[PDB]
Amino acid sequence: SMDDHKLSLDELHRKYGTDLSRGLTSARAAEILARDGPNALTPPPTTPEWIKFCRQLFGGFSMLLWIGAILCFLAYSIQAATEEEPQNDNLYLGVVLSAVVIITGCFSYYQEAKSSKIMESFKNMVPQQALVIRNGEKMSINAEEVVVGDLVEVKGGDRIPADLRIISANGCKVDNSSLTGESEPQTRSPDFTNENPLETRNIAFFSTNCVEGTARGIVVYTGDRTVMGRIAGQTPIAAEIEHFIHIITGVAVFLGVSFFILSLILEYTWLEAVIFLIGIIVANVPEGLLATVTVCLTLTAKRMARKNCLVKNLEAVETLGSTSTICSDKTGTLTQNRMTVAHMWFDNQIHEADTTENQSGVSFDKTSATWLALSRIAGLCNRAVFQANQENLPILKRAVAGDASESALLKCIELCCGSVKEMRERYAKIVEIPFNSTNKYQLSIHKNPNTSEPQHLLVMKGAPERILDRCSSILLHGKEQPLDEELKDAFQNAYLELGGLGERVLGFCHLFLPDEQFPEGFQFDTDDVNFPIDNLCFVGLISMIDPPRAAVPDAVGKCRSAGIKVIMVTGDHPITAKAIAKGVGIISEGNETVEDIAARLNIPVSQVNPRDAKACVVHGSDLKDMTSEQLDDILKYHTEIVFARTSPQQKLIIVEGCQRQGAIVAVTGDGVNDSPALKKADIGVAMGIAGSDVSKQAADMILLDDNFASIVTGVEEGRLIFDNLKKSIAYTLTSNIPEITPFLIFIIANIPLPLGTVTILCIDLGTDMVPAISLAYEQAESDIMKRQPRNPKTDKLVNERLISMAYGQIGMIQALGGFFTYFVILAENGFLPIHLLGLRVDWDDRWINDVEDSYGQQWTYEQRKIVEFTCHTAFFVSIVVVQWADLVICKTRRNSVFQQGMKNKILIFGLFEETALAAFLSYCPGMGVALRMYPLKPTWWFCAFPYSLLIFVYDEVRKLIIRRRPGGWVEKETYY
Amino acid sequence: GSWKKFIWNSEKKEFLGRTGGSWFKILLFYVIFYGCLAGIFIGTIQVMLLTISEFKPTYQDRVAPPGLTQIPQIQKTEISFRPNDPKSYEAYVLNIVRFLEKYKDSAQRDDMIFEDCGDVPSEPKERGDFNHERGERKVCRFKLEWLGNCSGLNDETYGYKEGKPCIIIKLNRVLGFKPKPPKNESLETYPVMKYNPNVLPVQCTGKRDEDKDKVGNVEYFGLGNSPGFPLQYYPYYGKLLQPKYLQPLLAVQFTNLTMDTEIRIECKAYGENIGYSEKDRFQGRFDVKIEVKS
Amino acid sequence: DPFYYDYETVRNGGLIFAGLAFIVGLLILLSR
Ligand SMILES: CCCCCCCCCCCCCCCCCC(=O)OC[C@H](COP(=O)([O-])OCC[N+](C)(C)C)OC(=O)CCCCCCCCCCCCCCCCC
Ligand SMILES: CCCCCCCCCCCCCCCCCC(=O)OC[C@H](COP(=O)([O-])OCC[N+](C)(C)C)OC(=O)CCCCCCCCCCCCCCCCC
Ligand SMILES: CC(C)CCC[C@H](C)[C@H]1CC[C@H]2[C@H]3CC=C4C[C@@H](OC(=O)CCC(=O)O)CC[C@@]4(C)[C@@H]3CC[C@@]12C
Ligand SMILES: CC(C)CCC[C@H](C)[C@H]1CC[C@H]2[C@H]3CC=C4C[C@@H](OC(=O)CCC(=O)O)CC[C@@]4(C)[C@@H]3CC[C@@]12C
Ligand SMILES: CC(C)CCC[C@H](C)[C@H]1CC[C@H]2[C@H]3CC=C4C[C@@H](OC(=O)CCC(=O)O)CC[C@@]4(C)[C@@H]3CC[C@@]12C
Ligand SMILES: CC(C)CCC[C@H](C)[C@H]1CC[C@H]2[C@H]3CC=C4C[C@@H](OC(=O)CCC(=O)O)CC[C@@]4(C)[C@@H]3CC[C@@]12C
Ligand SMILES: CC(C)CCC[C@H](C)[C@H]1CC[C@H]2[C@H]3CC=C4C[C@@H](OC(=O)CCC(=O)O)CC[C@@]4(C)[C@@H]3CC[C@@]12C
Ligand SMILES: CC(C)CCC[C@H](C)[C@H]1CC[C@H]2[C@H]3CC=C4C[C@@H](OC(=O)CCC(=O)O)CC[C@]4(C)[C@@H]3CC[C@@]12C
Numbered sequence A: 001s002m003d004d005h006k007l008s009l010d011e012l013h014r015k016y017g018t019d020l021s022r023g024l025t026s027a028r029a030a031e032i033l034a035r036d037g038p039n040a041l042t043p044p045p046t047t048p049e050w051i052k053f054c055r056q057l058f059g060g061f062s063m064l065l066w067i068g069a070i071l072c073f074l075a076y077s078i079q080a081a082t083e084e085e086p087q088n089d090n091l092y093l094g095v096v097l098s099a100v101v102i103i104t105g106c107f108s109y110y111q112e113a114k115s116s117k118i119m120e121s122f123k124n125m126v127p128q129q130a131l132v133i134r135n136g137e138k139m140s141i142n143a144e145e146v147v148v149g150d151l152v153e154v155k156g157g158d159r160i161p162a163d164l165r166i167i168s169a170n171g172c173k174v175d176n177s178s179l180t181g182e183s184e185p186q187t188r189s190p191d192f193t194n195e196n197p198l199e200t201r202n203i204a205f206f207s208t209n210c211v212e213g214t215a216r217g218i219v220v221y222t223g224d225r226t227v228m229g230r231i232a233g234q235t236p237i238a239a240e241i242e243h244f245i246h247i248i249t250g251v252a253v254f255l256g257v258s259f260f261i262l263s264l265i266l267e268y269t270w271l272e273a274v275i276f277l278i279g280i281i282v283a284n285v286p287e288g289l290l291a292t293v294t295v296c297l298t299l300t301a302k303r304m305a306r307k308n309c310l311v312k313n314l315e316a317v318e319t320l321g322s323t324s325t326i327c328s329d330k331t332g333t334l335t336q337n338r339m340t341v342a343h344m345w346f347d348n349q350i351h352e353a354d355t356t357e358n359q360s361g362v363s364f365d366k367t368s369a370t371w372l373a374l375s376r377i378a379g380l381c382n383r384a385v386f387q388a389n390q391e392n393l394p395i396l397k398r399a400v401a402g403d404a405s406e407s408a409l410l411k412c413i414e415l416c417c418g419s420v421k422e423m424r425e426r427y428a429k430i431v432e433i434p435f436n437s438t439n440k441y442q443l444s445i446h447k448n449p450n451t452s453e454p455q456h457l458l459v460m461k462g463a464p465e466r467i468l469d470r471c472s473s474i475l476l477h478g479k480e481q482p483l484d485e486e487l488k489d490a491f492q493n494a495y496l497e498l499g500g501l502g503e504r505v506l507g508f509c510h511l512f513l514p515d516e517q518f519p520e521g522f523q524f525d526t527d528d529v530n531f532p533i534d535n536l537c538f539v540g541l542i543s544m545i546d547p548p549r550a551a552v553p554d555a556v557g558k559c560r561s562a563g564i565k566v567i568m569v570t571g572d573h574p575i576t577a578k579a580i581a582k583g584v585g586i587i588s589e590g591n592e593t594v595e596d597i598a599a600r601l602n603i604p605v606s607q608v609n610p611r612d613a614k615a616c617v618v619h620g621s622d623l624k625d626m627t628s629e630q631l632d633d634i635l636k637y638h639t640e641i642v643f644a645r646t647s648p649q650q651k652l653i654i655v656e657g658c659q660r661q662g663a664i665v666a667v668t669g670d671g672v673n674d675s676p677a678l679k680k681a682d683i684g685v686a687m688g689i690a691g692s693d694v695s696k697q698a699a700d701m702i703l704l705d706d707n708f709a710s711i712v713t714g715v716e717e718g719r720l721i722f723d724n725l726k727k728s729i730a731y732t733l734t735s736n737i738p739e740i741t742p743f744l745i746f747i748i749a750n751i752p753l754p755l756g757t758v759t760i761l762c763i764d765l766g767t768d769m770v771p772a773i774s775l776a777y778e779q780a781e782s783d784i785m786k787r788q789p790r791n792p793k794t795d796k797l798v799n800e801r802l803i804s805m806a807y808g809q810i811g812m813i814q815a816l817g818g819f820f821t822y823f824v825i826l827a828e829n830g831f832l833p834i835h836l837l838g839l840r841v842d843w844d845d846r847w848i849n850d851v852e853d854s855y856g857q858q859w860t861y862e863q864r865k866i867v868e869f870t871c872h873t874a875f876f877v878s879i880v881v882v883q884w885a886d887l888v889i890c891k892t893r894r895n896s897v898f899q900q901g902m903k904n905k906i907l908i909f910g911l912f913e914e915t916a917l918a919a920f921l922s923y924c925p926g927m928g929v930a931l932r933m934y935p936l937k938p939t940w941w942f943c944a945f946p947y948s949l950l951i952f953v954y955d956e957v958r959k960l961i962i963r964r965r966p967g968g969w970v971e972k973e974t975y976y
Numbered sequence B: 001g002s003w004k005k006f007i008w009n010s011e012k013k014e015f016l017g018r019t020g021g022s023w024f025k026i027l028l029f030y031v032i033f034y035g036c037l038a039g040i041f042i043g044t045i046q047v048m049l050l051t052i053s054e055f056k057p058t059y060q061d062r063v064a065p066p067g068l069t070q071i072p073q074i075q076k077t078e079i080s081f082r083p084n085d086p087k088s089y090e091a092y093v094l095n096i097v098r099f100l101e102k103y104k105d106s107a108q109r110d111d112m113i114f115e116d117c118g119d120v121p122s123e124p125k126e127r128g129d130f131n132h133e134r135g136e137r138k139v140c141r142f143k144l145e146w147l148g149n150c151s152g153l154n155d156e157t158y159g160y161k162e163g164k165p166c167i168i169i170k171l172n173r174v175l176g177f178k179p180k181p182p183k184n185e186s187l188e189t190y191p192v193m194k195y196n197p198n199v200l201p202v203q204c205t206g207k208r209d210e211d212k213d214k215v216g217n218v219e220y221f222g223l224g225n226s227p228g229f230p231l232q233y234y235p236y237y238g239k240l241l242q243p244k245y246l247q248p249l250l251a252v253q254f255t256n257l258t259m260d261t262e263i264r265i266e267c268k269a270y271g272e273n274i275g276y277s278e279k280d281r282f283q284g285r286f287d288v289k290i291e292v293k294s
Numbered sequence C: 001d002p003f004y005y006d007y008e009t010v011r012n013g014g015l016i017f018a019g020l021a022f023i024v025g026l027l028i029l030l031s032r
């Protein structure tokens, strides 16, 4: 529809609630929030919960047990119709096959719902903020509470909260890639361009950004009523798991069909062969290893956001753990960003910090013209003011609007030399130039109140080595003495012992625009450059300290231990950056650059070989005159690199250079023009407090507290998931040998069958449902930040070592532990082991009701089948007992469980759940006719204890050999 | 495919990605590993065999009331034959002849092993104790002549040639078991027969109600005149102490079967020790289906 | 009697152990 861009500001009075200044009303905010809805948006309708439950209950691999239960009920119906003595033992098989899918479907649905509930909770954690000018005065709000007829202001970098209409613009250029697709910044103004609100210089739209400038505008459309509001996947670690499940499915289907076509040769009465096929293929495939990944990833994100490290998609979690290089900025990330003034320099004299709470202390306030002049520069170059409500505290406690490096010296010239509102009282205002990091300047023109110096004066500050070439003639004792080479030597030495303490320094100058040409009444303009910017009057330097964050020097050590390269990329001088890097420990104690080793040998710099220097400091102007081969050889030979005087456009070149050497780069950014570097690195890290919106729209994760240590704890949390997945995969695979080998020994050695189908399903249900998911909650080990970063093209999840450990070694002891209990029970009832060889054909004959045992007694068929089903029951119990020790040994990889502890409680609940299910399935009355599981003597419960102890002892001693002799033969062959 | 790289190199000599001095160690590890596993398994079996006696099983509650079987070893509890067709009943006669080999009078002459227990039913004979203090125990000898008209001293087809077939019933051996015949309250068991205090009684009747009108006459042959098992055998001492033990038998003949009908017959044994089951249709009891085609 | 072996005592003990090992796992899981 037609938007109100054609009507001017008078019709904007007469279209909304009578406000074009001073705010709308705080009371009418509730009125319009009651009239219409909040400024929200939901295009996904929902998919309901019952269809998601039916996808789990009838889905992949659980329909096999549904058709098995259907065949059991079908066979029971044919028996119950057409014969006498119906003998309902095919009904209990059907209800067992029903209960198993109902239990596994409810469990997998509960796991998926618990993961989705965490994943739809990372909303409303960093909510949007909109700057309105309510009646009160410029407040930020939750940005879904913007109303029509409201007046907002958008600066550079902010996201437009709703559909606007521009009232007063200072150079907004917006990026309309939300609806046009063009990424060119187009200007906005209260001027008129086109008779259509899509291609005008007027009204801006929802979900766009002013990339520069500052504009105030009224709100016309909120919520699901705007131009863009109306007309509007597979993690690379889950792909490996669901590819490995395909190969295990192939091996399981081959084993199942090969066992099925041998069951019919031994006369198994077709229904039992089909149920055996289904049980083998279901027990041999680890389908529940697919939800574990979703439990392992999601929970990891929940651990990261409590450590002030908020990911935006689940793919960033598993790529955070393989980081190899961190390219981080300094101010705000490595340092606290709270500057205080210390160690000024003027009149060839480094003064003291002026920090006492008593005036005229040790050394300040020698009231020459120099200090009042330099204080005039420090006060009249600032755009920062004290905020309101601050005549209650004096200096150290106030809150200042603006940046930190301007507020810091605002907090110094209020201590001595009067006030700064006094300086606004004295001098006038004409025009200003705001500081940007491509000019390193800040100059402003001002009118003197007096005619003592009747010429009109401009004040200027910035980076000192870039100021000094412009502002040349030094005012030393109020004079205009010209330059000497020793004056620049004194300046360079002063900057040396000012930057050696790790202090930020600025430079100051002024010019007196003489009225020999232009008189006292003479209007002035700036971007019309009609004023001298060369040969001004330098004054002196003011330095500021910036204390490092308290957790940084431990974080840099943890990066060094883990093999992570750290690259400091600043915008400061190569002296201050070098001193800060030596302070926190980037440049380590023992590495040296080329300059200090040239100075300690008193030799010139163009003679030293640049291969004994492990550290480097690269100036930002030299990075422009480096070709792409001249760049990566600085990223190869040096281990500790610091880039100084680097423009934020040059960060992208460093990211691409680090990526061309085969690395995973994490890059910190907080600006509008940091966005090309953020969606080019493998991890983009935006800042949460002092961060833009374009920065935190283009980043993979957000730092909630702007701290370098939280990135390192995010790397630890990302490193935990590969260990926790490998342990769970190693646990689930060990129960395949005990579920397979009974049929092979039954058909090779011709003994009565040690394990049946129902007990296979019971083994798999218990011991692979709960303790497999318990291994995802496992804590970290002692040396997770002591290993190299994984190469996510060479290190896979499933090795050859893992398969040989799970199948070849632990599974065989787990099979023998059950076979021992089998021979124990059959030997104690009367059938000694050598008697059992070759007994299979007579044992399973239904019409031989006197089968002679070792003592001469004679057995009925149903008398000996009860002994066989007792053997099945104790096979299941012995598998539970050895899976105890398997779950205890799988929770570490090289540490022992005595230096790890038993703090995982899901694991202890899994152990108790295993034992309780095994005791109830055996000793409950009625289990003999339904499951055909019979009670055990108490002394038969301790038959598998030696094999549990053997598993524990062997796997402890192997880890001790791995710890004592690293890189040995055992670490080559058994470290999975 | 991926030939000549993952199979053989000969620029590092790595068959299957492993050099030949590395294939030796990884096979020596598995040979030693499975050797120690086999050793530990054999050792635990050997240790468990020391707690097992060689005279008495550890648990006897899964054979505790014995079964009751019949000697023409048939395939679905079915006997069907034609008397004027000597190839239909030949397998039955061959089964009976192969069973009654060791019961012959010429196979019991060794007087230091066999002994002459009485020709009337008597009390159980305790041979001592399960302690090997007397060596091998002697066994009572069973004469075939007590199965008269059912033994092989006459008609050698055991009645199958002349219509009326005959089965031989026996109770399963349980080590240490002494059967207790019922008491004599004259109300206790069912319905009426000749009672003896040293005979475990057996009775074979028709199963349904139309079978009681068609089974006809049933003759019993055993030791004495009360049909059942005598008690001067039992309780059996196991095949270590008593090889060549001979369990007592009972022959049953059906002299007046109805022709060309399938007749169901149930044989039950009565006593205090003897109990029955509902799933085990062979415990203390059995049933047979006879069908004499004409 | 060498032919009896009452199974009710071991059944009572096994069900007591099942109830105990279930409620202790319930108290270990819900300890958070
Ligand atoms: C009908 C008869 C049944 C026979 C017994 C059943 C046992 C067979 C079950 C084992 C098969 C399971 C292996 C699945 C492989 C998964 C594919 C995969 O992704 O792996 C990638 C890896 C890729 O390798 P990589 O990435 O890890 O590193 C390089 C490895 N090479 C150099 C080999 C390439 O491939 C493998 O896993 C190699 C498998 C080697 C074999 C592992 C030892 C198995 C020993 C089991 C036999 C022990 C006795 C079994 C029971 C007999 C007792 C009666
Ligand atoms: C009763 C159970 C409780 C005790 C359980 C015992 C568990 C011990 C199992 C792991 C220990 C394996 C010992 C390997 C020692 C060799 C390592 C070494 O010294 O490195 C240098 C030596 C020398 O090799 P290398 O280190 O120099 O490697 C060669 C690489 N280049 C060529 C570059 C130098 O390592 C070896 O070569 C040893 C290879 C032989 C492998 C072992 C031989 C068979 C013995 C293993 C049987 C395991 C018993 C299992 C029985 C348990 C039953 C459940
Ligand atoms: C992991 C899977 C492949 C093992 C399961 C199969 C069983 C281990 C098989 C292999 C050979 C079988 C048996 C073959 C015969 C021997 C005789 C036996 O000898 C004795 O202990 C007593 C001999 C004596 O005292 O005279 C030792 C174990 C045993 C029963 C073996 C026990 C294990 C059996 C049942
Ligand atoms: C799961 C893997 C380890 C295979 C199983 C390992 C076992 C050692 C295998 C190997 C060959 C098998 C058997 C094949 C040959 C027989 C003949 C047997 O001799 C007899 O007296 C049997 C008498 C009869 O069968 O009537 C003694 C050894 C035995 C049981 C072997 C015992 C060991 C078996 C079960
Ligand atoms: C024992 C340790 C190594 C395992 C730690 C966790 C397990 C849950 C623990 C707790 C107590 C242990 C067992 C102590 C003895 C009982 C006897 C058993 O019941 C009987 O004694 C049979 C006769 C009867 O129950 O009356 C029930 C399970 C069991 C093995 C317990 C199963 C669980 C064990 C292994
Ligand atoms: C761990 C390896 C290197 C050494 C093996 C030492 C094991 C502790 C041995 C000692 C006695 C063995 C077993 C001997 C008899 C079996 C079955 C059962 O014993 C009985 O059957 C006795 C019952 C009765 O007669 O009343 C309970 C104990 C058990 C499991 C024992 C478990 C421990 C075994 C394997
Ligand atoms: C399963 C692997 C990992 C370790 C092997 C454990 C046992 C040592 C296996 C190996 C082969 C098995 C058996 C296969 C062959 C038989 C024949 C047997 O000789 C006989 O008495 C049977 C013939 C007869 O004399 O009547 C003696 C050894 C025995 C029990 C073997 C005993 C050891 C078994 C149980
Ligand atoms: C049949 C058996 C062999 C299977 C289970 C044996 C387990 C190895 C047992 C042995 C003693 C048990 C635990 C007893 C309590 C301690 C707590 C823990 O003690 C601490 O000092 C942890 C301190 C920390 O939190 O860092 C160390 C491991 C642990 C020994 C043990 C881990 C292994 C357990 C479950």
Ligand SMILES: Nc1ncnc2c1ncn2[C@@H]1O[C@H](COP(=O)(O)OP(=O)(O)OP(O)(O)=S)[C@@H](O)[C@H]1O
Residues within 6 Å of the ligand: A329, A330, A331, A403, A405, A406, A435, A437, A440, A441, A442, A461, A462, A463, A464, A505, A506, A569, A570, A571, A572, A573
């Ligand atoms: N408001 C300002 N007025 C005049 N000069 C400034 C101002 N702010 C910074 N400078 C100087 O110009 C340099 C370039 O600006 P920045 O990019 O912000 O450098 P930086 O803040 O010290 O380091 P980072 O980690 O890139 S924020 C600064 O290092 C100062 O030396």
Ligand SMILES: *[C@@H]1O[C@H](CO)[C@@H](O[C@@H]2O[C@H](CO)[C@@H](O)[C@H](O)[C@H]2NC(C)=O)[C@H](O)[C@H]1NC(C)=O
Residues within 6 Å of the ligand: B148, B149, B219
């Ligand atoms: C055992 O068999 C013999 C013949 O083999 C039966 O003796 C005959 O029985 C019939 C029955 O009426 C008499 O008419 C004959 O006179 C008998 N002959 C002889 C020589 O005794 C005998 O009855 C059978 N015993 C039974 C059925 O208990």
Ligand SMILES: *[C@@H]1O[C@H](CO)[C@@H](O)[C@H](O)[C@H]1NC(C)=O
Residues within 6 Å of the ligand: B213, B214, B215, B216, B217, B256, B257, B258
């Ligand atoms: C068999 O003969 C007897 C003669 O005592 C007679 O009572 C009985 O009814 C006959 N049975 C049949 C089925 O003919």
Ligand SMILES: [Mg+2]
Residues within 6 Å of the ligand: A331
């Ligand atoms: Mg900055």
Ligand code: NA
Residues within 6 Å of the ligand: A282, A283, A284, A285, A286, A287, A764
């Ligand atoms: Na499964």
Ligand code: NA
Residues within 6 Å of the ligand: A678, A679, A680, A681, A682, A683, A684, A699, A700
């Ligand atoms: Na990215």
Ligand code: NA
Residues within 6 Å of the ligand: A731, A732, A733, A734, A735, A767, A883, A886
């Ligand atoms: Na397992």
Ligand code: NA
Residues within 6 Å of the ligand: A283, A284, A285, A735, A736, A739, A764
């Ligand atoms: Na399995």
